[PDB]
Design a protein around this motif. Structure first.
Motif, PDB file in Angstrom:
ATOM      1  N   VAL B 198       0.872  -1.094  -0.020  1.00 44.61           N
ATOM      2  CA  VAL B 198       0.021  -0.032  -0.102  1.00 44.61           C
ATOM      3  C   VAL B 198       0.776   1.320   0.098  1.00 44.61           C
ATOM      4  N   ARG B 199       0.609   2.359  -0.923  1.00 47.11           N
ATOM      5  CA  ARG B 199       1.172   3.455  -0.851  1.00 47.11           C
ATOM      6  C   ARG B 199       0.351   4.665  -0.260  1.00 47.11           C
ATOM      7  N   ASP B 200       0.590   5.934  -0.526  1.00 46.46           N
ATOM      8  CA  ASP B 200      -0.061   6.877   0.167  1.00 46.46           C
ATOM      9  C   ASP B 200      -1.397   6.998  -0.490  1.00 46.46           C
ATOM     10  N   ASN B 201      -1.627   6.741  -1.860  1.00 50.07           N
ATOM     11  CA  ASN B 201      -2.835   6.887  -2.477  1.00 50.07           C
ATOM     12  C   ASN B 201      -3.345   5.652  -3.455  1.00 50.07           C
ATOM     13  N   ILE B 202      -2.679   4.379  -3.210  1.00 45.94           N
ATOM     14  CA  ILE B 202      -2.867   3.390  -4.088  1.00 45.94           C
ATOM     15  C   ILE B 202      -2.218   1.883  -3.442  1.00 45.94           C
ATOM     16  N   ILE B 203      -2.924   1.006  -3.478  1.00 51.97           N
ATOM     17  CA  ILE B 203      -2.511  -0.404  -3.311  1.00 51.97           C
ATOM     18  C   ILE B 203      -2.184  -1.272  -4.248  1.00 51.97           C
ATOM     19  N   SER B 222      -7.152   1.880  -6.522  1.00 58.75           N
ATOM     20  CA  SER B 222      -6.623   3.219  -6.485  1.00 58.75           C
ATOM     21  C   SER B 222      -7.655   4.024  -5.753  1.00 58.75           C
ATOM     22  N   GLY B 223      -7.558   5.552  -5.614  1.00 63.02           N
ATOM     23  CA  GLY B 223      -8.466   6.280  -4.616  1.00 63.02           C
ATOM     24  C   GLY B 223      -8.064   6.332  -3.404  1.00 63.02           C
ATOM     25  N   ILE B 224      -7.249   5.893  -2.809  1.00 66.36           N
ATOM     26  CA  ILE B 224      -6.635   5.726  -1.188  1.00 66.36           C
ATOM     27  C   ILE B 224      -6.545   6.958  -0.984  1.00 66.36           C
ATOM     28  N   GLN B 225      -7.205   7.400   0.141  1.00 65.57           N
ATOM     29  CA  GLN B 225      -7.065   9.096   0.838  1.00 65.57           C
ATOM     30  C   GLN B 225      -5.739   8.891   1.323  1.00 65.57           C
ATOM     31  N   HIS B 226      -5.429   8.027   2.699  1.00 61.86           N
ATOM     32  CA  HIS B 226      -4.046   8.269   3.264  1.00 61.86           C
ATOM     33  C   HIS B 226      -3.794   6.653   3.768  1.00 61.86           C
ATOM     34  N   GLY B 227      -3.309   5.915   2.761  1.00 62.29           N
ATOM     35  CA  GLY B 227      -3.095   4.631   2.974  1.00 62.29           C
ATOM     36  C   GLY B 227      -1.936   4.461   4.002  1.00 62.29           C
ATOM     37  N   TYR B 228      -2.028   3.644   5.037  1.00 70.55           N
ATOM     38  CA  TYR B 228      -0.944   3.286   5.935  1.00 70.55           C
ATOM     39  C   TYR B 228      -0.966   1.592   5.925  1.00 70.55           C
ATOM     40  N   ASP B 229      -2.181   0.888   6.127  1.00 75.85           N
ATOM     41  CA  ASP B 229      -2.311  -0.357   6.447  1.00 75.85           C
ATOM     42  C   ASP B 229      -3.280  -1.164   5.483  1.00 75.85           C
ATOM     43  N   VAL B 230      -3.164  -2.162   5.085  1.00 79.00           N
ATOM     44  CA  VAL B 230      -4.079  -3.154   4.380  1.00 79.00           C
ATOM     45  C   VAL B 230      -4.317  -4.570   4.903  1.00 79.00           C
ATOM     46  N   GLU B 231      -5.528  -5.089   4.765  1.00 81.01           N
ATOM     47  CA  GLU B 231      -5.880  -6.240   5.416  1.00 81.01           C
ATOM     48  C   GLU B 231      -6.533  -7.063   4.122  1.00 81.01           C
ATOM     49  N   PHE B 232      -6.480  -8.498   4.418  1.00 81.09           N
ATOM     50  CA  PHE B 232      -7.000  -9.345   3.346  1.00 81.09           C
ATOM     51  C   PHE B 232      -7.839 -10.434   3.877  1.00 81.09           C
ATOM     52  N   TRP B 241      -9.438  -1.934   3.870  1.00 76.63           N
ATOM     53  CA  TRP B 241      -8.426  -0.795   4.308  1.00 76.63           C
ATOM     54  C   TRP B 241      -9.400   0.278   4.831  1.00 76.63           C
ATOM     55  N   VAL B 242      -8.836   1.141   5.490  1.00 76.46           N
ATOM     56  CA  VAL B 242      -9.589   2.380   6.308  1.00 76.46           C
ATOM     57  C   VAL B 242      -9.431   3.389   5.477  1.00 76.46           C
ATOM     58  N   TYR B 450       6.298   7.395  -1.509  1.00 80.67           N
ATOM     59  CA  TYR B 450       5.057   7.266  -0.590  1.00 80.67           C
ATOM     60  C   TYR B 450       4.939   5.866  -0.349  1.00 80.67           C
ATOM     61  N   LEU B 451       5.975   5.089  -0.014  1.00 82.28           N
ATOM     62  CA  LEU B 451       5.925   3.702   0.635  1.00 82.28           C
ATOM     63  C   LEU B 451       5.278   3.628   2.051  1.00 82.28           C
ATOM     64  N   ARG B 452       4.361   2.576   2.324  1.00 84.98           N
ATOM     65  CA  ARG B 452       3.745   2.542   3.320  1.00 84.98           C
ATOM     66  C   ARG B 452       3.775   0.897   3.751  1.00 84.98           C
ATOM     67  N   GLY B 453       2.836   0.515   4.692  1.00 80.32           N
ATOM     68  CA  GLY B 453       2.896  -0.741   5.096  1.00 80.32           C
ATOM     69  C   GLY B 453       2.894  -1.807   4.298  1.00 80.32           C
ATOM     70  N   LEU B 454       3.307  -3.006   4.586  1.00 78.27           N
ATOM     71  CA  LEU B 454       3.143  -4.073   3.835  1.00 78.27           C
ATOM     72  C   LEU B 454       2.449  -5.364   4.282  1.00 78.27           C
ATOM     73  N   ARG B 455       1.930  -6.158   3.520  1.00 83.84           N
ATOM     74  CA  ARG B 455       1.361  -7.615   3.773  1.00 83.84           C
ATOM     75  C   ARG B 455       1.323  -8.282   2.625  1.00 83.84           C
ATOM     76  N   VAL B 456       1.175  -9.827   3.131  1.00 83.73           N
ATOM     77  CA  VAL B 456       1.262 -10.946   1.904  1.00 83.73           C
ATOM     78  C   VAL B 456       0.079 -11.398   1.863  1.00 83.73           C
ATOM     79  N   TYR B 457      -0.519 -11.511   0.712  1.00 84.17           N
ATOM     80  CA  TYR B 457      -1.839 -12.119   0.512  1.00 84.17           C
ATOM     81  C   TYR B 457      -1.630 -13.612  -0.010  1.00 84.17           C
ATOM     82  N   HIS B 458      -1.917 -14.460   1.224  1.00 83.84           N
ATOM     83  CA  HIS B 458      -1.797 -16.098   1.092  1.00 83.84           C
ATOM     84  C   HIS B 458      -3.150 -16.772   1.490  1.00 83.84           C
ATOM     85  N   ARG B 459      -3.224 -18.023   1.173  1.00 85.21           N
ATOM     86  CA  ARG B 459      -4.222 -18.876   1.510  1.00 85.21           C
ATOM     87  C   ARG B 459      -4.067 -19.307   2.914  1.00 85.21           C
TER      88      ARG B 459
END
Ligand SMILES: *[C@@H]1O[C@H](CO)[C@@H](O)[C@H](O[C@@H]2O[C@H](CO)[C@@H](O[C@@H]3O[C@H](CO[C@H]4O[C@H](CO)[C@@H](O)[C@H](O)[C@@H]4O)[C@@H](O)[C@H](O[C@H]4O[C@H](CO)[C@@H](O)[C@H](O)[C@@H]4O)[C@@H]3O)[C@H](O)[C@H]2NC(C)=O)[C@H]1NC(C)=O
Ligand SMILES: *[C@@H]1O[C@H](CO)[C@@H](O[C@@H]2O[C@H](CO)[C@@H](O[C@@H]3O[C@H](CO[C@H]4O[C@H](CO)[C@@H](O)[C@H](O)[C@@H]4O)[C@@H](O)[C@H](O[C@H]4O[C@H](CO)[C@@H](O)[C@H](O)[C@@H]4O)[C@@H]3O)[C@H](O)[C@H]2NC(C)=O)[C@H](O)[C@H]1NC(C)=O
Ligand SMILES: *[C@@H]1O[C@H](CO)[C@@H](O[C@@H]2O[C@H](CO)[C@@H](O[C@@H]3O[C@H](CO[C@H]4O[C@H](CO)[C@@H](O)[C@H](O)[C@@H]4O)[C@@H](O)[C@H](O[C@H]4O[C@H](CO)[C@@H](O)[C@H](O)[C@@H]4O)[C@@H]3O)[C@H](O)[C@H]2NC(C)=O)[C@H](O)[C@H]1NC(C)=O
Ligand SMILES: *[C@@H]1O[C@H](CO)[C@@H](O)[C@H](O[C@@H]2O[C@H](CO)[C@@H](O)[C@H](O)[C@H]2NC(C)=O)[C@H]1NC(C)=O
Ligand SMILES: *[C@@H]1O[C@H](CO)[C@@H](O[C@@H]2O[C@H](CO)[C@@H](O)[C@H](O)[C@H]2NC(C)=O)[C@H](O)[C@H]1NC(C)=O
Ligand SMILES: *[C@@H]1O[C@H](CO)[C@@H](O[C@@H]2O[C@H](CO)[C@@H](O)[C@H](O)[C@H]2NC(C)=O)[C@H](O)[C@H]1NC(C)=O
Ligand SMILES: *[C@@H]1O[C@H](CO)[C@@H](O)[C@H](O)[C@H]1NC(C)=O
Ligand SMILES: *[C@@H]1O[C@H](CO)[C@@H](O)[C@H](O)[C@H]1NC(C)=O
Ligand SMILES: *[C@@H]1O[C@H](CO)[C@@H](O)[C@H](O)[C@H]1NC(C)=O
Ligand SMILES: *[C@@H]1O[C@H](CO)[C@@H](O)[C@H](O)[C@H]1NC(C)=O
Ligand SMILES: *[C@@H]1O[C@H](CO)[C@@H](O)[C@H](O)[C@H]1NC(C)=O
Ligand SMILES: [Ca+2]
Ligand SMILES: [Ca+2]
Ligand code: NI
Ligand code: NI
Lengths: 5, 988, 5, 6, 424, 5
Positions: B198-203, B222-232, B241-242, B450-459
């Motif tokens: 996730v970046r400042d405005n896009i994941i 796209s269209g993220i306002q202030h991206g910090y974290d992402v969840e799946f 995301w928030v 504008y790098l932000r938090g990270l997360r790995v999508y996995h089953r």
């Protein structure tokens, strides 16, 4: 000003 | 890439596009993207707006820097210029063709032009636009020539793309995240993991393979306002995301079903996210309210509960950053910034039900970052920006050690498989490194801002990590929370308390009400409970000064204030769980808003104080009725905070004005006595214990918390010293006093007995703009006659019609009359039948007694249409004639009967105009009025007939008459203003 | 002339 | 005018 | 002595003579021993020691209590740890103990000057903004309690309130009869020994110092202008640093103030001038080339007429011929111009629309001119001193080169490339 | 324009 109602 | 053109005819099946990056070029490729070829790369600076001439197989292209329009064949060999070295082109953007003309849009001149497609002659302007015209197209069948479709016989599972390859002229493809199977016609979903960055405005979804740079593991968000974290959630394929307003958003990996999932919190915006995939719950941080809360994903209706809050202890939430959960183990972990004189910077752990708080690691942790968890290895990873390191430690609080160092500003951190991934906001890099001692460094991406938090999508298999909540579905009514050892603790959304069953929920019935300028909040009186005991009253237009409660009916009353917006002043009520929001008092609020609210639960009377610029009023409103009455009206004194006590039947209010004092009076603001006038400067809040009869007040000017008995006498100091700078509000519950302190931003609790030296215990910490505190409990508002000293107003309002006022030692109440005069029976109200005063106010007729000390209205306000202007009263029929002004051009003369009996105004004459005067001849029964629009004084009969003109004057007003002498007088306020006299016939 | 914020 | 559209 | 968190330095200013001399003592170098974010400062003139409370910097200096000689030549870290949100530091010269306020923990701590025996004196404070020790008592002010309180210096006991209900409380100090004879040092024993600044050091000795832009002569008493220093240019200012890293003094009077949006800088060593170019996209007056002496005198506007919308983008002085090559950039075309110093002669030597030279360097030794292009065709281009016989040195593997340098001894061209993250 | 700060 204005002498209205 | 800007330009794009297509030739899907069976022979060609080619696509053209233009790129204006460094080394600008125009490229050709097959429609499936295979045979990529650069056709033009010379004499171009800013290519744009491609378009294809189908009959001639030429590609037209445009340059906004060199300012030309050109065309060439599909290989770019026969280049020609149609418009070159010409000043028409300023910043052309798009191009289209039809027959022998080329239409293009210019961003410099903001106009659409037309020219011959071969030599650029016959230039003309098609249309002028106030805005820059970007896209243009010519809709005609000639622009879509027919051709054979080779994909008709194709059996491609997802996508059939045309191709320039001769044998088939088509190729099968499939969306992002799918594999082309060996049969080359079918595609299967790729179950491999991928990294969400996730970046400042896009994941973005990028592959774990560092050699792949496509950024197409999933459709970007796209269209993220202030991206910090992402969840799946790997099942159901959803990404979470928030957003800024306090909402959570949801979209699938294929780009569909994008929606607002549920509101998160009304008190601010959330920061971190953690999802329990086994029990289907999501945990998030709210740094604004300094709390950790959980939202339910399983059901159709959303439930939210604040798990951990800032209670001032070290074992608590100071400023939460990121969460990690272990659903199998039942533990929740979060990284916390410290607070001044409070929680330190730490890595803390707790059960996923909010209990068993623990501090794992503390020390060099300034500028902490997101924590992450390796569930298999049971180790925590976190970043420390102030030291530029990544640290690792066991979940029990041991073996803390530095893993990666010499970083600039780590922002993202995730560990999957045998590797550790981190995104560094400076160095603009996403990097992979071994989790074992941090060697073998590999760069995935770089030069990404504008790098932000990270997360790995996995089953993730919930079956192989089951816990108590998954083993016991439908056990809890609203929220199930896992607990270490395979157990589970049921929970209820904010505003509800768990029933003795342990599986069912019931509304809160014993909690404190804390009012702040931004919002009204409720906290349970059990200090260990950090959950919100009330749905917070927060949102636009909220500026709360005081709050009061009605326990029996389940309401919370609060008064808003605003010195700029008039409409946002008044008294509102709402249920503790939301539900029936209502406006209680909105009309007649002074320049200063409502300054105090007191509710008499026995009689249903609501006492409030509104303050004008140089005076203030104390008023009663009877709940669920239009009866409002002013009790006391003062100018030298200023009551601000008023409390009511039905047991002893008294009213108390603080002043803090030029002569500060605490006053005592009956329930009708009569018999005003002064309790304390010495050693008082700024009393801001009163309180009472019903079982002891002591008045508790606070004074921030003397830093005093003191009490005085209801009968008066000595003033006893409860809390004093420099450690209590700004006590703003106070309440007494049981054996303890509870007060809010603005400077310390804390809600305190201490013993009510004077002389105690035990330090107060903090309920909540770091709350901005504290205003007051109030207890919501049955014991605080008793209703039985045994303890209310048999209050007469309990029994059907004591038999009174408008208001019931009980007296401290009398067995019968004094009935109060909102409008009219109290009847002979002492309980009914009727029209005054006295000499009083009447006047007009916009669209209403209002009355007023001649006594300035009499606050009772002679009759209820009469509502009319238009704007009433002039008044006159007819004694014989008890009717008042009044003019109404409508749309500034027409007017009416209407009368309403003062006999009441559901009488309503009715019109006597219409279509007059502006009429500013009425005088009724009580002898001849004729109405004289001054028509200002038509510039004459006219006289009509009482029934509205045989109207006649008296005289014509410039600007008439204020007619008076004297029939006993046959003279009428009026005022002309035009040029040569004067008072004229004429006979009742208009002569002389 | 009294409070706000 | 900057040729970027955003 | 005073600290400037904006510049992140501890500076000394004289108030003895008629002319004011200022100097930077400790500056924010890479090492933890430097200055991160100085809050408070205390001095011990009789022993030549300086103490200051410091916040941390990311990956650099930790939040600490530090000690150094008053001439700044011996840095030391005394206390570090639970020092988040440090307040001012005060020194009790009699007992030789330091006192600090830690807002995060809400405590006032005490420790010896040598870095031993740290211990907490006062608990449960809200925001102890300022404190001072005089006699047997300790006075502190709490900004949130809005109180000024006196406690014993040996323990937080015997608390007494002096003032209360006072808003906006800040630091404290006691005006008393400090005697300049009972406490003496090398500078007092040796007046008018140093030319500009005298700074005492431990052992009763003293070390001379010079104002910014001046350095000690070998005699140890006089000052001379700096001869070898780096000229670092930034948007708000132009600053000079010594080329030997032990000296934190400002080797040049900083060119700063209103109107400075410096893009590039160049030097004229023989005449002692520093040239820089200001750029403003709004104000047409703030565009041009200016020069100044390294000591801050003889300010002059060098080029002010004919600057394009994009402004001057590079300046290179030919110290042999006195020519000042600069690049004048317009919206859709770019010029390369020469101005002869102390003359009105000025001419254009090349106009290009597709190319865009931005940063330019000159080598009179080889009679070549080099500029860096970051347009649609990034490249490093070389030409004669009249920009007439052009060739391309680098044309591939280069995206946005915004810096050039010459070795002058090995003949290599160095450049920085921020889009590919390398120096080649 | 590149740097106008
Ligand atoms: C363009 O116009 C600008 C407009 O201001 C002029 O500044 C500039 O003219 C001048 O260029 C000469 C170049 O030589 C500069 O003269 C030199 O100044 C040096 C500094 O002098 C200071 O310090 C010395 C220390 O000893 C002191 O004696 C001086 O009184 C003064 O405080 C100086 O060191 C240097 O001396 C060398 O050359 C001398 C030649 O006579 C020898 O005598 C001496 O032995 C030594 O070899 C020299 O005098 C001058 O500073 C500068 N003008 C000003 C006002 O700064 C013009 N030139 C260009 C093209 O830039
Ligand atoms: C859809 O298309 C993609 C691209 O072909 C495929 O993705 C690859 O799939 C294979 C098999 O799942 C993956 O191989 C696994 O790699 C793991 C380690 O990954 C690192 O190293 C590999 C190179 O070896 C890198 O590509 C990768 O980026 C990482 O750096 C191993 O740990 C796995 O081993 C496990 O299984 C084997 C076999 O049973 C056991 O022997 C081991 O003990 C262990 O349990 C495995 O080798 C490969 O990493 C994937 N590449 C990508 C792009 O991630 C999908 O397979 C394909 N899906 C379908 C449906 O076709
Ligand atoms: C002005 O007008 C408003 C309405 O606009 C009134 O507000 C109502 O006040 C009454 C007070 O009685 C409220 O009724 C009470 O609700 C309680 C909660 O009900 C829930 O829980 C029960 C028990 O599980 C369920 O049966 C029920 O369906 C709900 O889910 C009840 O516990 C109370 O019951 C008690 O009183 C009733 C008679 O009212 C008895 O029959 C019962 O035996 C018991 O003694 C009660 O029903 C009502 O909810 C309020 N409505 C709203 C919209 O808020 C104000 O009272 C009125 N102002 C004044 C001052 O009177
Ligand atoms: C004052 O009187 C006018 C004329 O009768 C009346 O329109 C106002 O009441 C309301 O004004 C609103 C704003 O124009 C309008 O939206 C609303 O419909 C209207 N109500 C009626 C009955 O028409 C009166 N305003 C005030 C402030 O009393
Ligand atoms: C479009 O432009 C062409 C020229 O490119 C015009 O053709 C000329 O018209 C004039 C006036 O009638 C003649 O004298 C010339 O002989 C024509 N030929 C050329 C090549 O100049 C044409 O009239 C224009 N048509 C319109 C409708 O604008
Ligand atoms: C995602 O959106 C799609 C499209 O709206 C939903 O799929 C269909 O939606 C229509 C209209 O609501 C329904 O009538 C169909 O029954 C839906 N079909 C299926 C297969 O669900 C889909 O329900 C949405 N999914 C979620 C969970 O949001
Ligand atoms: C209060 O809210 C409830 C639930 O929305 C509704 O059913 C009820 O009619 C409302 N009552 C009043 C009087 O507003
Ligand atoms: C209350 O007021 C009445 C009328 O002024 C007076 O007679 C009486 O003494 C006062 N005191 C009380 C508490 O009755
Ligand atoms: C006044 O003047 C005109 C002309 O006499 C008359 O017709 C009208 O009815 C009167 N009032 C109005 C509405 O202008
Ligand atoms: C340069 O500055 C010095 C000191 O202000 C002054 O005496 C001298 O005249 C100046 N020289 C010029 C050329 O302005
Ligand atoms: C300079 O250009 C000339 C042509 O005008 C060419 O012959 C010569 O090779 C070039 N010189 C150098 C040093 O490249
Ligand atoms: Ca152009
Ligand atoms: Ca105070
Ligand atoms: Ni950070
Ligand atoms: Ni502070």
């Amino acid at each position: 000003x204005x002498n209205x109602x | 890439p800007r330009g794009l053109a297509l030739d899907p005819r069976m022979g060609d099946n080619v696509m053209f596009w233009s790129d204006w990056g460094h080394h600008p070029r125009i490229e050709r490729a097959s429609m499936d993207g295979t045979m990529r070829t650069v056709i033009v790369q010379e004499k171009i600076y800013w290519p744009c707006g491609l378009s294809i001439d189908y009959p001639n197989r030429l590609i037209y292209f445009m340059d906004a820097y060199l300012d030309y329009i050109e065309f060439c064949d599909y290989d770019g060999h026969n280049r020609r210029q149609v418009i070159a070295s010409d000043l028409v082109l300023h910043h052309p953007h798009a191009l289209t063709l039809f027959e022998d003309f080329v239409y293009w849009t210019d961003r410099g001149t903001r106009q659409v032009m037309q020219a011959n497609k071969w030599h650029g002659g016959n230039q003309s302007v098609v249309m002028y636009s106030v805005h820059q015209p970007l896209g243009i197209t010519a809709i005609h069948p000639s622009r879509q020539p027919p051709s054979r479709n080779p994909c008709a016989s194709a059996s491609c599972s997802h996508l059939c793309l045309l191709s320039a390859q001769a044998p088939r002229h088509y190729s099968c493809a499939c969306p992002s995240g799918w594999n082309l199977s060996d049969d080359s016609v079918n595609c299967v979903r790729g179950d491999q993991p991928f990294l969400m960055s996730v970046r400042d405005n896009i994941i973005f979804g990028i592959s774990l393979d560092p050699e792949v740079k496509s950024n197409d593991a999933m459709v970007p968000i796209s269209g993220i306002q202030h991206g910090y974290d992402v969840e799946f959630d790997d099942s159901e394929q959803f990404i979470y995301w928030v957003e800024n307003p306090g909402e959570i958003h949801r979209v699938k990996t294929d780009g569909s079903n994008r929606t607002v999932f549920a509101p998160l919190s009304l008190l601010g915006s959330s920061l971190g996210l953690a999802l329990d995939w086994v029990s289907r719950n999501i945990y998030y941080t709210t740094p604004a309210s300094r709390s950790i809360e959980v939202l339910t994903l399983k059901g159709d209706t959303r439930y939210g509960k604040t798990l951990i809050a800032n209670d001032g202890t070290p074992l608590g939430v100071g400023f939460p950053v990121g969460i990690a959960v272990d659903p199998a183990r039942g533990k929740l972990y979060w990284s916390d910034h410290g607070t001044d004189s409070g929680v330190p910077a730490k890595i803390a752990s707790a059960n996923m039900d909010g209990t068993s708080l623990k501090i794992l690691f503390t020390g060099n942790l300034q500028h902490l970052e997101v924590v992450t968890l390796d569930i298999q290895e049971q180790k925590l990873y976190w970043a420390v920006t102030s030291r530029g390191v990544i640290e690792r430690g066991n979940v029990d609080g041991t073996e803390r050690m530095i893993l990666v160092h010499h970083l600039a500003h780590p922002w993202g951190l995730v560990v999957y498989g045998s590797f550790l991934y981190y995104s560094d906001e400076q160095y603009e890099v996403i990097e992979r490194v071994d989790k074992s001692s941090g060697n073998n460094k590999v760069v995935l991406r770089d030069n990404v801002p504008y790098l932000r938090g990270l997360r790995v999508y996995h089953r993730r298999n919930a079956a192989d990590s089951s816990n108590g909540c998954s083993n016991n579905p439908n056990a809890c009514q609203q929220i199930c929370l896992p607990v270490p050892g395979g157990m589970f603790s049921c929970a209820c959304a904010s505003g509800f308390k768990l029933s003795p069953d342990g599986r069912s929920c019931s509304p809160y019935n014993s909690f404190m009400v804390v009012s702040m300028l931004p919002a009204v909040r409720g906290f349970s009186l059990e200090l260990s409970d950090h959950s919100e005991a009330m749905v917070p009253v927060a949102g636009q237009g909220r500026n709360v000064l005081h709050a009061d409660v009605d326990v029996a009916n389940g309401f919370i009353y609060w008064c808003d204030f605003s010195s700029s917006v008039r409409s946002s002043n008044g008294i509102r009520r709402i249920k503790p769980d939301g539900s029936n929001f209502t406006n209680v008092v909105t009309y007649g609020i002074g320049a200063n808003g409502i300054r105090g609210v007191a509710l008499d639960w026995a009689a249903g009377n609501l006492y409030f104080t509104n303050a004008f610029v140089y005076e203030t009023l104390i008023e009663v409103l009877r709940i669920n009725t239009t009866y409002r009455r002013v009790l006391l009206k003062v100018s030298v004194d200023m009551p601000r905070h008023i409390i009511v006590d039905p047991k002893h039947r008294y009213l108390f209010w603080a002043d803090y004005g030029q002569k500060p004092k605490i006053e005592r009076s009956f329930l009708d603001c009569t018999n005003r006595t002064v309790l304390v006038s010495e050693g008082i400067v700024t009393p801001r809040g009163l309180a009472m214990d019903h079982d002891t009869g002591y008045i508790y007040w606070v004074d921030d000017s003397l830093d005093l918390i003191a009490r005085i008995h209801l009968d008066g006498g000595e003033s006893q100091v409860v809390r004093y010293g420099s450690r209590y700078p700004t006590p703003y509000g106070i309440t007494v519950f049981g054996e303890s006093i509870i007060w809010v302190d603005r400077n310390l931003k804390k809600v305190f609790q201490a013993s009510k007995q004077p002389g105690n030296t035990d330090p107060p215990v903090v309920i909540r910490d770091k709350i901005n703009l504290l205003r007051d505190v109030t207890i919501f409990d049955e014991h605080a508002q008793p209703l039985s006659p045994a303890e209310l000293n048999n209050n007469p107003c309990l029994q059907s309002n004591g038999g009174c019609s408008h208001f019931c006022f009980a007296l401290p030692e009398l067995p019968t109440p004094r009935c109060g009359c909102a409008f009219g005069t109290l009847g002979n029976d002492g309980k009914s109200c009727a029209t005054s039948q006295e000499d009083f005063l009447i006047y007009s106010l916009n669209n209403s007729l209002r009355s007023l007694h001649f006594d300035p000390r009499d606050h009772s209205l002679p009759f209820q306000v009469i509502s009319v249409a238009g704007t009433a202007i002039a008044l006159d009263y007819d004694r014989r029929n008890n009717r008042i004639f009044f003019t109404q002004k409508l749309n500034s051009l027409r007017g009416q003369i209407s009368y309403v009967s003062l006999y009441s009996g559901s009488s309503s105004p009715t019109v006597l004459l219409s279509n007059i105009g502006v009429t500013d005067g009425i005088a009724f001849d009580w002898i001849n029964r004729r109405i004289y009025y001054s028509d200002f629009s038509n510039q004459t004084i006219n006289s009509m009969a009482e029934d509205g007939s045989n109207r006649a003109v008296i005289a014509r004057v410039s600007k008439p007003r204020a007619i008076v008459l004297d029939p006993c002498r046959g003279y009428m007088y009026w005022t002309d306020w035009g040029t040569n203003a004067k008072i004229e006299r004429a006979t009742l016939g208009g002569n002389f | 002339x009294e409070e706000x914020x | 005018x900057x040729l970027x559209x955003x």
